[PDB]
């Protein structure tokens, strides 16, 4: 359940272009919200065939 969770995070976060992220100072990347990681329906995931 942890393995399937990680890959989707990669998928859309990379289909995007971003704008330079995560400098090395904790508490900054927590404010990196955007519109590109909410482009999927929460239930439109066909895990089963």
């Amino acid at each position: 359940t942890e393995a399937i969770r990680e890959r989707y995070q990669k998928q859309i976060e990379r289909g995007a272009a971003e704008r330079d992220f995560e400098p090395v100072t904790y508490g900054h990347a927590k404010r990196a919200g955007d519109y590109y990681m909410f482009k999927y329906d929460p239930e439109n995931d066909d895990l089963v065939e």
Binding site: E22, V24, T25
Partner: protein
């Protein structure tokens, strides 16, 4: 009333910007967990109070 609203907005903006600068004035490795000292240098006090 508009005067008071403007002063409140100025105070809020000033506080936010200054907190961002103070947080940025101290670099911090993005990953390593909180050190044992730091934790006991912050958590412990609260519990006792």
């Amino acid at each position: 009333f508009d005067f008071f609203n403007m002063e409140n907005f100025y105070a809020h903006i000033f506080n936010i910007k200054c907190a961002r600068q103070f947080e940025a004035a101290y670099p911090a490795p993005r990953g390593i967990p909180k050190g044992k000292l730091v934790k006991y240098m912050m958590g412990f006090p609260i519990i006792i109070g």
